[PDB]
Design a protein around this ligand. Structure first.
Ligand SMILES: Nc1nc2c(ncn2[C@@H]2O[C@H](COP(=O)(O)OP(=O)(O)OP(=O)(O)O)[C@@H](O)[C@H]2O)c(=O)[nH]1
Ligand SMILES: Nc1ccn([C@@H]2O[C@H](COP(=O)(O)OP(=O)(O)OP(=O)(O)O)[C@@H](O)[C@H]2O)c(=O)n1
Ligand SMILES: [Mg+2]
Ligand SMILES: [Mg+2]
Lengths: 135, 49, 736
RNA sequence: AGUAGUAACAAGAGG
RNA sequence: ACCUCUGCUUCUGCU
């Protein structure tokens, strides 16, 4: 659902910074993710303590509801949940938009001498828009 | 006890000097022929400009 | 006209065409046969650089131990190990003063780490010297062997599961009169003497480094045993925690982050300079870094960094340096000999070198053996000086950085000053001053200070120029970092993991290089085409409509003729290549999902298939790659698990050896672990905790699972009873 | 012989 | 002779 505009040619400094690399994370720490994934995939092995956060709780229910009767290996389900739920970053040379949905297609939109104007399909984050509005 | 039992030869290589044939080979390597030597596999269709 | 590619440099700046100077389309150099020669070389050189120091005989091992610390000062520019304790201490104090609270914090974190670290952390190493066998083994196998032999000889604090308790066992094991191990003639109990055991504990095995680029000649590397590894781990963690907060440290930051840090350092420097100052940069390397590092100095560093901290922790961290001061090197595999006259050949061992007749050897090797004889002890070579390759990368980095830290204007108060960045022995030093004479003096001050702490700048490897261009570990800066695509060429190919992992790795490599190493779009397209061909030939998964003959042709042709939507077949199933620039980041299975005959898709993605060998979340979709330069890297890849996610067969050579029994032990262990996981699925995700036996946990779980299944109606009352019955019979059978 | 290149291969091990 | 097994496994390290 992406849209392509023109390619332009110019020199631009691509400055190295840390950027987000996985759109759709739920901004959990690894211990909150673990806690959640334990509840979702292996509930009876949770141990003593349980989830304070309400974010944790509504994710759990959603995921728990999405993945009932699931016969894909629990290893892959936990692996994917961990990849999805935790914010991951990387240092990349990046000239333009730093949002994760743009980072994801950096190889496509940015070259040494070119920009391929592009808009990914889907909604922006309200956070990203607010941030861009200020800039 | 074998008298000539000895460590394997472990010396520097024998030296050799430049000859004209290597430059000549390289000249020929950089030249056009009238054959296409490399066949490339297919790509997905081009979409982005 | 004679063609000369070098003439491009008449027009194109060397950095802008640097890619062409890296010949990484050919096989890199390999050693053949023994490394014993290279081991003797490093042992000899290491002593030579420290030769004016003091010899002692070790009370416990009998090893001859050379101590060059606080020895006579260098008198020329030859590599020196005569590091001076008081100078090191001044530098470390300087680092403490520049960074108040840094030592305390890094110590605090290291303490927490010591309390929390599990024994199984040591499973993360690669090939490890295994003293119970006097042979190398995978890290986990080496750990298990140590634990097992320890417990049989009465050391088992490590049963706690805490690394620190295993460390206690290690020190306590040295009090034993005679450590019993078993060798395989069937099975024989062998008793090591206290001295034997300690020598093995203090051993680093040695071998030669293969596949290293950029060098005519080979060199030796080393692998420590399990007695050493847990202590080194914590010293290097402490040092890492410090390095992370030093602006002058190049570790542990990696590629892009390293470049960002270097660029910041230049920017910082220039802002702090006056307009009237000259600025020069040394592209810097050190001679024989590891051979001139000294365990006694590391001991000093550790005691000074941990000043004011609890004494148990200071003493725990001091262990690694002490062990290194007392280390020995196994001398490798020995040599082979040959008789022309009798057309025969034979292997002698490294141990034979103690007393073999010298007539068998070339003059060079005879001289080496003569020199090494006074160091040999129960088959090893005493090596008190040096650290050996890469053993304390981070702590050694702290030493180099401490010299960089000295260069502040307010410390020197000279007509010059310096700053820079250091990673191990590699550095960029920026020297500023009013005139060229100031620069020279500053460079001499830096160089001579380094000498005083056993750091020896390589004169032939280093050079200087006005600031603006420089090189740092194959990153080229010309008023900003330029690309070096050729460094990455070896990574363009079929990785050899499996069909699923390799497709994802191959497309990602292309994409990453477009982003990071200026791989232009046309060449990226051609990279896709070249990869697909290599994948098809490697895996014999030519497109279903082709007429090549392989062992796979007929079965792939049937799949093809029978398929309705061929565009949905994976390449490994004889399908077409879907990739272009825009979709390199999309796993093939996703990309083709909507185009797949539903039956193929349901087979391909059948979770019940017998091909996929899942193991652990933490090692899921992980490959190991060996880059052209530097250590092995773990590589994450994005892929759907399918029947293409298979595992190639294991090596079978051990079947012909006395060690074949190990295969059986592994099979048994795996069977026990597998069944355990049928009761505790979460154990594939996180590691389970407990002092309970595997059996007890499985019994408790079966019972209470069967009860909930009963109430919830997942199971009959008959089934349920048989489960609790089976449990009771297991309970009983467990009493003989 | 040839590969190679500081030490190896030119099958090893076992029966 | 001939038989059997093996093709990274006595040798691939460190942050
Ligand atoms: N600990 C450790 N350090 C390494 C390793 N590989 C390289 N280094 C260090 O990193 C430095 C940079 O390597 P490169 O510049 O890529 O290669 P090089 O051939 O040593 O360097 P040049 O002299 O620039 O040709 C080396 O000189 C070492 O100091 C490794 O596997 N382990
Ligand atoms: N594969 C490698 C390469 C390097 N090193 C570490 O990096 C240091 C610097 O490497 P290098 O400059 O290549 O070698 P030196 O030991 O300094 O020797 P020289 O420069 O004189 O060749 C080594 O001493 C060692 O501690 C390592 O552990 N593993
Ligand atoms: Mg060096
Ligand atoms: Mg170096």
């Amino acid at each position: 659902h992406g849209t392509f505009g023109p390619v332009k040619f110019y020199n631009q400094v691509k400055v190295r910074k840390r950027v987000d690399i996985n759109p759709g994370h739920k901004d959990l720490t690894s211990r909150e993710a673990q806690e959640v994934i334990m509840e979702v995939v292996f509930p009876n092995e949770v141990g003593a303590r349980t989830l304070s956060s309400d974010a944790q709780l509504t994710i759990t229910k959603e995921k728990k509801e999405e993945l009932k009767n699931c016969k894909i290996s629990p290893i892959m389900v936990a692996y994917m949940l961990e990849r999805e739920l935790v914010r991951r970053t990387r240092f990349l040379p990046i000239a333009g938009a730093t949002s994760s949905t743009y980072v994801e297609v950096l190889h496509l939109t940015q070259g040494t001498c070119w920009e391929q104007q592009y808009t990914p399909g889907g909604e922006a984050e309200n956070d990203d828009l607010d941030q861009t509005l200020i800039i | 006890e074998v008298p000539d039992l000895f460590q394997y030869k472990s010396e520097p290589p024998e030296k050799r000097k430049l000859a004209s044939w290597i430059q000549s080979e390289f000249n020929k390597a950089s030249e056009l022929t009238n054959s296409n030597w490399i066949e490339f596999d297919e790509l997905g269709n081009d979409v982005a400009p | 006209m004679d063609v000369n590619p070098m003439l491009i440099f008449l027009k194109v700046p060397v950095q802008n065409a640097i890619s062409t100077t890296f010949p990484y389309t050919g096989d890199p150099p390999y050693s053949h046969g023994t490394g014993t020669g290279y081991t003797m070389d490093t042992v000899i050189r290491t002593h030579d650089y420290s030769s004016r120091g003091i010899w002692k005989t070790n009370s416990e091992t009998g090893a001859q131990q050379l101590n060059p610390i606080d020895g006579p000062l260098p008198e020329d520019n030859e590599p020196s190990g005569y590091a001076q304790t008081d100078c090191v201490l001044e530098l470390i104090e300087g680092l403490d003063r520049s960074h108040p609270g840094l030592f305390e914090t890094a110590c605090q974190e290291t303490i927490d780490a010591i309390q929390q670290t599990r024994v199984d952390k040591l499973t993360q190493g690669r090939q490890t010297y295994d003293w119970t066998l006097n042979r190398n083994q995978p890290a986990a196998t080496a750990l298990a062997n140590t634990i097992e032999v320890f417990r049989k000889n009465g050391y088992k604090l490590n049963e706690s599961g805490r690394l620190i308790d295993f460390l206690k066992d290690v020190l306590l094991s040295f009090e034993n009169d005679s450590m019993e191990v078993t060798t395989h003639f069937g099975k024989k109990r062998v008793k090591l003497t206290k001295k034997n055991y300690l020598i093995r504990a203090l051993t680093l095995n040695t071998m030669t480094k293969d596949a290293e680029r950029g060098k005519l000649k080979r060199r030796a590397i080393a692998t420590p045993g399990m007695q050493i590894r847990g202590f080194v781990y914590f010293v290097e963690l402490l040092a890492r925690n410090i390095c992370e907060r030093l602006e002058q440290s190049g570790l542990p930051v990696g590629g892009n982050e390293k470049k960002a840090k270097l660029a910041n350092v230049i920017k910082k420097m220039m802002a702090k300079s006056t307009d009237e100052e000259l600025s020069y940069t040394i592209t810097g390397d050190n001679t024989k870094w590891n051979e001139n590092q000294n365990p006694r100095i590391f001991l000093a560093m550790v005691l000074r960094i941990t000043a004011g901290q609890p004494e148990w922790f200071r003493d725990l961290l001091a262990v690694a340096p002490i062990m290194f001061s007392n280390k020995v090197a196994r001398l490798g595999r020995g040599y082979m000999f040959e008789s022309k006259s009798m057309h025969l050949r034979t292997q002698i061992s490294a141990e034979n070198l103690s007393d073999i007749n010298l007539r068998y050897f070339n003059e060079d090797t005879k001289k080496k053996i003569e020199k090494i004889r006074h160091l040999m002890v129960e088959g090893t070579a005493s090596l008190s000086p040096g650290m050996m390759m890469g053993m304390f990368n981070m702590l050694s980095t702290v030493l180099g950085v401490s010299v960089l830290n000295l260069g502040q204007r307010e410390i020197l108060k000279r007509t010059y000053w310096w700053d820079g960045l250091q990673s191990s022995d590699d550095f960029a030093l920026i020297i500023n001053g009013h005139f060229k004479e100031d620069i020279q003096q500053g460079v001499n001050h830096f160089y001579r200070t380094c000498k005083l702490v056993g750091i020896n700048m390589s004169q032939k490897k280093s050079y200087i120029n006005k600031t603006g261009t420089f090189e740092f570990t194959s990153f080229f800066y010309r008023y900003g970092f330029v690309a070096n695509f050729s460094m990455e060429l070896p990574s363009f190919g079929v990785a050899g993991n499996n069909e699923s992992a390799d497709m994802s790795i191959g497309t990602t490599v292309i994409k990453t290089n477009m982003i990071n190493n200026d791989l232009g779009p046309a060449t990226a397209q051609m990279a896709i085409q070249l990869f697909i061909k290599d994948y098809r030939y490697t895996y014999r998964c030519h497109r279903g409509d082709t007429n090549l003959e392989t062992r796979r042709t007929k079965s792939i042709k049937r799949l093809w003729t029978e398929t309705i939507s061929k565009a949905g077949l994976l390449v490994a199933d004889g399908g077409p290549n879907p990739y272009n620039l825009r979709n390199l980041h999309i796993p093939e299975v996703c990309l083709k999902w909507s185009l797949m005959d539903p039956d193929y898709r349901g087979r391909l993605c059948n979770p019940n298939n017998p091909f996929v060998h899942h193991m652990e979340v933490e090692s899921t979709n992980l490959a190991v790659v060996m880059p052209a330069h530097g250590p092995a890297k773990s590589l994450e890849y994005d892929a759907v698990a399918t029947t293409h996610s298979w595992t190639p067969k294991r090596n079978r050579s051990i079947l012909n050896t006395n060690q074949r029994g190990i295969l059986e032990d592994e099979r048994i262990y795996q069977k026990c672990c597998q069944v355990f996981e049928k009761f505790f699925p979460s154990s594939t995700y996180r590691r389970p905790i407990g002092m309970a036996s595997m059996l007890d946990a499985m019994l408790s779980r079966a019972r209470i699972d069967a009860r909930i299944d009963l109430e919830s109606g997942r199971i009959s009352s008959q089934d349920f009873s048989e489960i609790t019955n089976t449990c009771k019979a297991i309970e009983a059978l467990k009493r003989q």
